[PDB]
Amino acid sequence: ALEKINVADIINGAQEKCVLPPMDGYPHCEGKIKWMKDMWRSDPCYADYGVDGSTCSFFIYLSEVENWCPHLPWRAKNPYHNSLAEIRTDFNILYSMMKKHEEFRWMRLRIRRMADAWIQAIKSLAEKQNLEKRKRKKVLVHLGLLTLGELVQWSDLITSLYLLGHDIRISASLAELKEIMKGCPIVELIYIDIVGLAQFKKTLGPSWVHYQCMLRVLDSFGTEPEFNHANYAQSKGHKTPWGKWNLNPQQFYTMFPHTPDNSFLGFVVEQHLNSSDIHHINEIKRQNQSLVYGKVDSFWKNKKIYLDIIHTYMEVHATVYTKNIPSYVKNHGILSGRDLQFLLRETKLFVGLGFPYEGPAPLEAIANGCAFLNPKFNPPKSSKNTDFFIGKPTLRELTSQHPYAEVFIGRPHVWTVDLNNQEEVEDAVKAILNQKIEPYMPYEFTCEGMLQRINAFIEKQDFCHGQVMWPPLSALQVKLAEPGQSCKQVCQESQLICEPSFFQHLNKDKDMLKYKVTCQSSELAKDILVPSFDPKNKHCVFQGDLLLFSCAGAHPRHQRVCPCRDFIKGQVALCKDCL
Ligand SMILES: *[C@@H]1O[C@H](CO)[C@@H](O)[C@H](O)[C@H]1NC(C)=O
């Protein structure tokens, strides 16, 4: 109400024609000014803000109210409340929220185990980083899952939101969701899973789209733009019922940083050994023994030749819940987290069999000083060729059993080898026996690293207030992908990551000239594979449907114009200027 009076006051003192500034960072401003010339009477709210038909009034409305146009210094900034978030160092409020429904018992038990580690981490982050003056956000979390990787991630996200001081409302039923949920521009963010999102749409019906900018959707395997755009997915013949939400794809939150079109949420790799356990393990030398990754004996089918090669150099151990198990294997059965990590500390090699795909267990092994033998996949596995991935709303390809371990950890902790190739396996086992490796845990999978990441998303990632401005455009590094290469690939092989919020700044002739791409001619297509550049004719094809901007996808004929950003080593979700 007073924001309307505030903007009207600015317009009352403004010239007829704003001398418009440079549009850098705001590529939709001019198109929306033109839209206002035709449409500022279609809704009385624009006039309620003081819009009077002058183009300067359009500009003022679009910058000050909707943030689609650059901000001008209309008013001075006054160099001088209760609304601030304070970090929490006590869990009783969170437990009392979860003590209402009973499949929260597993999560409460995990949080109680990890409580001291979480509290040390939030205190440590606040001692290193300036966390003052953050606004307390009102957050809804709806766990459709409740109506194991999924549970761990939910637990650590909820814990992180809580430790950072935000006001959380937890919903775990349709009835709870319905009661809670009862331009021109209560709850500010809504964390939800894929099951819960379907429930959200049904509870709200067609008006759900008014809340969609607030959604952060936990989606372990990721959703690519080709599948997120419902009409495009249909035009490609995709039969999967998944995807089709038409969200900004950065609103999907993944388990590992494998899909740069999405955001990486992750989780914490729990530490089960306390200081007494650790001191007792410095007692005992790590043995020349291996431990096979895989709890179900059916995972071991046809792995005998591979294990025999390992068995030539090392004892072979297992934790199996026994047809396919060689008789020389020492089976411990299922172990507690503490007993498992004791075993990992006496173990030189954690042996992947090819399945399961990208879980936490290899990171747990590496964090206890084991090397991981990581089977390589050629062809890479994807929804195109692997029954286990049928219906996934993404063509993402796995190049090994644990692509994160392959790409972001690597040797000497991770030896990515063809398990069928005896020479490659032997070369790895021999080098692992004679190598010095220390326990290693990527910062992003620690309590403190997860808090830093989630804090940055809460403070900086915003889809509800017009122009996306984070990561900052200063971080953009433009690369040309060759034909047959995706934008995801061309950033990754240069130790960068694709940043999909930057595509919109690379989508016309004038913008392309900033990066020494000169288009003699140009056209518009609605295609995930553009902006594209034909270097023979210097013909550019730009994006005609902004929801199809896509890090994934290789152009068969032309070069792709690809927006990369730097990432902080060990914190891939953030650029150095992202905070
Ligand atoms: C270490 O963990 C064991 C759990 O069996 C517990 O008995 C012991 O009190 C713990 N010691 C410390 C110092 O945390």
Residue numbers in the entry: 128 to 207, 212 to 278, 295 to 329, 337 to 339, 345 to 480, 484 to 741
Give the text the authors published on this PDB structure:
We tested a series of constructs truncating the N-terminal region and found T121-L741, named GnT-V luminal domain, is sufficient for catalytic reaction without impairing protein production in mammalian cells. We determined the crystal structure of GnT-V luminal domain (T121-L741) in apo form at 1.9 Å resolution by the native single-wavelength anomalous diffraction (SAD) method. Overall structure of GnT-V luminal domain has a cross-like shape and is composed of four subdomains: N-terminal domain (A128-Y207 in blue and G337-P339 in cyan in Fig. 2a), middle domains 1 (H212-K329 and I345-L424 in green, and E606-H627 in yellow) and 2 (G425-Y605 in orange), and C-terminal domain (G628-L741 in pink). As both of the two middle domains take Rossmann folds, GnT-V is classified into the GT-B fold. As the other human GnTs also require a divalent cation for catalysis, GnT-V is unique among human GnTs. The four subdomains of GnT-V luminal domain do not exist independently but instead are tightly connected by two short insertions (shown in cyan and yellow in Fig. 2a), as well as interregional disulfide bonds such as C172-C338 and C372-C626. And, the N-terminal domain is linked to middle domain 1 via three missing loop regions, signifying the highly mobile nature of this domain. GnT-V luminal domain contains eight disulfide bonds in total and five of them are located at the C-terminal domain. In the crystal structure, only one N-glycan was assigned at N433. E297 is located at the lid of the cleft formed by the two middle domains and is likely well positioned to act as a catalytic base.
